[PDB]
Protein backbone atom coordinates (compact mmCIF):
# COMPACT_ATOMS: atom_id res chain seq x y z
CA UNK A 1 0.00 0.00 0.00
CA UNK A 2 0.92 3.69 -0.18
CA UNK A 3 -0.10 6.95 1.55
CA UNK A 4 -1.70 9.43 -0.84
CA UNK A 5 -3.35 12.78 -0.21
CA UNK A 6 -0.55 14.88 -1.72
CA UNK A 7 2.03 12.95 0.06
CA UNK A 8 2.45 10.62 -2.67
CA UNK A 9 2.31 13.39 -5.09
CA UNK A 10 4.73 15.57 -3.24
CA UNK A 11 7.18 12.76 -3.02
CA UNK A 12 6.97 11.98 -6.51
CA UNK A 13 7.46 15.55 -7.25
CA UNK A 14 10.60 16.16 -5.52
CA UNK A 15 11.95 13.07 -7.00
CA UNK A 16 11.26 14.30 -10.37
CA UNK A 17 12.75 17.64 -9.76
CA UNK A 18 16.04 16.24 -8.63
CA UNK A 19 16.18 13.99 -11.54
CA UNK A 20 15.32 16.83 -13.79
CA UNK A 21 18.27 18.69 -12.63
CA UNK A 22 20.44 15.65 -13.45
CA UNK A 23 19.05 15.99 -16.99
CA UNK A 24 20.10 18.61 -19.56
CA UNK A 25 18.37 19.73 -22.76
CA UNK A 26 14.86 19.46 -24.17
CA UNK A 27 14.37 16.65 -21.71
CA UNK A 28 14.82 18.72 -18.54
CA UNK A 29 12.02 21.05 -19.41
CA UNK A 30 9.89 18.07 -19.92
CA UNK A 31 10.65 16.36 -16.62
CA UNK A 32 9.77 19.77 -15.17
CA UNK A 33 6.37 19.66 -16.86
CA UNK A 34 5.78 16.21 -15.38
CA UNK A 35 6.84 17.56 -11.98
CA UNK A 36 4.49 20.55 -12.10
CA UNK A 37 1.71 18.32 -13.45
CA UNK A 38 1.87 16.11 -10.35
CA UNK A 39 1.68 19.22 -8.14
CA UNK A 40 -1.80 20.13 -9.45
CA UNK A 41 -3.39 17.32 -7.40
CA UNK A 42 -2.32 18.53 -3.91
CA UNK A 43 -2.90 22.12 -5.02
CA UNK A 44 -6.44 21.08 -5.99
CA UNK A 45 -6.88 19.56 -2.53
CA UNK A 46 -5.49 22.77 -1.03
CA UNK A 47 -7.84 24.82 -3.21
CA UNK A 48 -10.92 22.82 -2.20
CA UNK A 49 -9.95 22.79 1.49
CA UNK A 50 -9.40 26.57 1.52
CA UNK A 51 -5.75 26.43 2.59
CA UNK A 52 -3.16 28.60 0.88
CA UNK A 53 -1.46 26.70 -2.01
CA UNK A 54 1.66 28.85 -1.53
CA UNK A 55 2.23 27.84 2.09
CA UNK A 56 1.04 24.28 1.44
CA UNK A 57 3.19 23.66 -1.64
CA UNK A 58 6.22 25.44 -0.18
CA UNK A 59 5.96 23.50 3.09
CA UNK A 60 5.76 20.09 1.38
CA UNK A 61 8.63 20.84 -1.01
CA UNK A 62 10.85 22.27 1.74
CA UNK A 63 10.00 19.61 4.34
CA UNK A 64 10.16 16.57 2.05
CA UNK A 65 13.52 17.71 0.67
CA UNK A 66 14.87 17.94 4.23
CA UNK A 67 13.35 14.83 5.86
CA UNK A 68 13.25 11.41 4.18
CA UNK A 69 9.89 10.40 5.73
CA UNK A 70 7.41 10.38 2.83
CA UNK A 71 3.94 10.15 4.46
CA UNK A 72 3.18 13.89 4.90
CA UNK A 73 0.54 15.44 2.64
CA UNK A 74 -2.29 17.97 2.49
CA UNK A 75 -4.55 17.88 5.55
CA UNK A 76 -7.99 18.84 4.22
CA UNK A 77 -10.13 18.32 7.34
CA UNK A 78 -8.21 21.04 9.22
CA UNK A 79 -6.27 18.98 11.75
CA UNK A 80 -3.30 20.51 13.55
CA UNK A 81 -0.80 17.85 12.39
CA UNK A 82 -0.07 16.93 8.77
CA UNK A 83 1.55 13.56 9.58
CA UNK A 84 -0.76 10.90 8.13
CA UNK A 85 0.34 8.12 10.51
CA UNK A 86 -2.19 9.44 13.05
CA UNK A 87 -4.97 10.47 10.62
CA UNK A 88 -5.86 6.90 9.47
CA UNK A 89 -5.54 7.28 5.68
CA UNK A 90 -4.24 4.48 3.43
CA UNK A 91 -4.44 3.94 -0.37
CA UNK A 92 -3.40 1.02 -2.63
CA UNK A 93 -0.31 1.02 -4.83
CA UNK A 94 -2.12 -0.42 -7.85
CA UNK A 95 -4.70 2.38 -7.63
CA UNK A 96 -2.27 5.30 -7.42
CA UNK A 97 -0.05 3.75 -10.11
CA UNK A 98 -2.86 3.57 -12.69
CA UNK A 99 -3.48 7.32 -12.37
CA UNK A 100 -0.04 8.00 -13.86
CA UNK A 101 0.00 5.12 -16.36
CA UNK A 102 -3.43 5.67 -17.93
CA UNK A 103 -2.83 9.44 -17.95
CA UNK A 104 0.62 9.43 -19.55
CA UNK A 105 -0.40 6.73 -22.05
CA UNK A 106 -3.56 8.60 -23.10
CA UNK A 107 -1.83 11.99 -23.55
CA UNK A 108 0.61 10.38 -26.00
CA UNK A 109 -2.43 9.59 -28.15
CA UNK A 110 -3.92 13.06 -27.60
CA UNK A 111 -0.69 14.78 -28.69
CA UNK A 112 -0.18 12.73 -31.83
CA UNK A 113 -3.46 13.88 -33.41
CA UNK A 114 -2.91 16.45 -36.18
CA UNK A 115 -5.87 16.00 -38.56
CA UNK A 116 -9.29 16.21 -36.87
CA UNK A 117 -12.31 15.40 -39.07
CA UNK A 118 -15.76 15.46 -37.44
CA UNK A 119 -18.71 14.39 -39.59
CA UNK A 120 -21.76 16.39 -38.56
CA UNK A 121 -24.78 14.28 -37.66
Amino acid sequence: VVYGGGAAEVTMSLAVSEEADKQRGIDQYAFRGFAQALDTIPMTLAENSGLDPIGTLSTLKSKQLKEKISNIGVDCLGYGSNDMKELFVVDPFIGKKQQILLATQLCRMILKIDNVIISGK
Binding site: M109, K112, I113, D114, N115, V116, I117, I118, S119, K121
Partner: protein, 50 residues
Protein backbone atom coordinates in the same frame (compact mmCIF):
# COMPACT_ATOMS: atom_id res chain seq x y z
CA UNK B 1 -5.00 11.24 -37.75
CA UNK B 2 -8.42 11.54 -36.09
CA UNK B 3 -11.36 10.50 -38.31
CA UNK B 4 -15.06 10.59 -37.40
CA UNK B 5 -17.47 9.10 -39.93
CA UNK B 6 -21.19 9.86 -40.30
CA UNK B 7 -22.19 7.22 -37.71
CA UNK B 8 -20.30 9.18 -34.99
CA UNK B 9 -17.76 6.63 -33.84
CA UNK B 10 -14.30 7.68 -33.24
CA UNK B 11 -11.43 5.88 -34.84
CA UNK B 12 -7.83 7.02 -34.31
CA UNK B 13 -5.06 5.52 -36.45
CA UNK B 14 -1.47 6.11 -37.60
CA UNK B 15 -1.24 3.78 -40.60
CA UNK B 16 -2.91 4.74 -43.86
CA UNK B 17 -4.71 1.40 -44.29
CA UNK B 18 -7.75 2.12 -42.09
CA UNK B 19 -7.67 5.92 -42.51
CA UNK B 20 -8.49 5.50 -46.20
CA UNK B 21 -11.03 2.76 -45.38
CA UNK B 22 -12.98 5.15 -43.13
CA UNK B 23 -13.03 8.00 -45.66
CA UNK B 24 -15.39 6.74 -48.37
CA UNK B 25 -13.67 7.98 -51.54
CA UNK B 26 -15.85 9.06 -54.47
CA UNK B 27 -13.11 9.93 -56.98
CA UNK B 28 -11.71 6.94 -58.93
CA UNK B 29 -8.19 8.39 -59.13
CA UNK B 30 -8.08 8.85 -55.35
CA UNK B 31 -9.30 5.24 -54.91
CA UNK B 32 -6.01 4.05 -56.45
CA UNK B 33 -4.16 5.05 -53.28
CA UNK B 34 -6.80 3.24 -51.21
CA UNK B 35 -6.54 0.00 -53.20
CA UNK B 36 -2.74 -0.25 -52.94
CA UNK B 37 -2.92 0.62 -49.23
CA UNK B 38 -5.29 -2.29 -48.59
CA UNK B 39 -3.23 -4.49 -50.92
CA UNK B 40 -0.04 -3.56 -49.06
CA UNK B 41 -1.91 -4.14 -45.79
CA UNK B 42 -3.14 -7.53 -47.04
CA UNK B 43 0.12 -8.78 -48.58
CA UNK B 44 2.91 -7.41 -46.34
CA UNK B 45 1.42 -5.18 -43.61
CA UNK B 46 4.01 -2.36 -43.59
CA UNK B 47 4.68 0.80 -45.57
CA UNK B 48 1.04 1.66 -46.26
CA UNK B 49 1.80 5.37 -45.79
CA UNK B 50 5.07 5.38 -47.76
Amino acid sequence: ILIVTSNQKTTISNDGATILKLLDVVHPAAKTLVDISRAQDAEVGDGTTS
